[PDB]
């Protein structure tokens, strides 16, 4: 997820409000990245035998 776009992106005024929450969605961008990596490792364990 582009969490800027998801909450309200391409807007100066929305960005200024989104930024008052710091890393509130950054941590989820990281959580989804971690999940995608785990899913790739999982695919390799099943098929690259």
């Amino acid at each position: 997820v582009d969490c800027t776009m998801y909450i309200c992106g391409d807007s100066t005024e929305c960005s200024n409000l989104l930024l008052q929450y710091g890393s509130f969605c950054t941590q989820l961008n990281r959580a989804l990245t971690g999940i995608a990596v785990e899913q790739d490792k999982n695919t390799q364990e099943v098929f690259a035998q």
């Binding site: 582009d2 800027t4 776009m5 992106g9 391409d10 961008n29 990245t33």
Partner: protein, 49 residues
């Protein structure tokens, strides 16, 4: 790009791999504003012609 990675990872050294550091989005180059036309065309020509 290497320094995008170094700050994302909070490090002065980088291990082999791919790191997501940001997002890019294409912005508008022009604005397309369209409102419908009036069916009943205006008789200005009845005073001028």
């Amino acid at each position: 790009p290497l320094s995008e990675t170094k700050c994302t990872l909070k490090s002065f050294t980088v291990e082999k791999g791919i790191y997501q550091t940001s997002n890019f989005r294409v912005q508008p180059t022009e604005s397309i504003v369209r409102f419908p036309n009036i069916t009943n065309l205006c008789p200005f020509g009845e005073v001028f012609n």
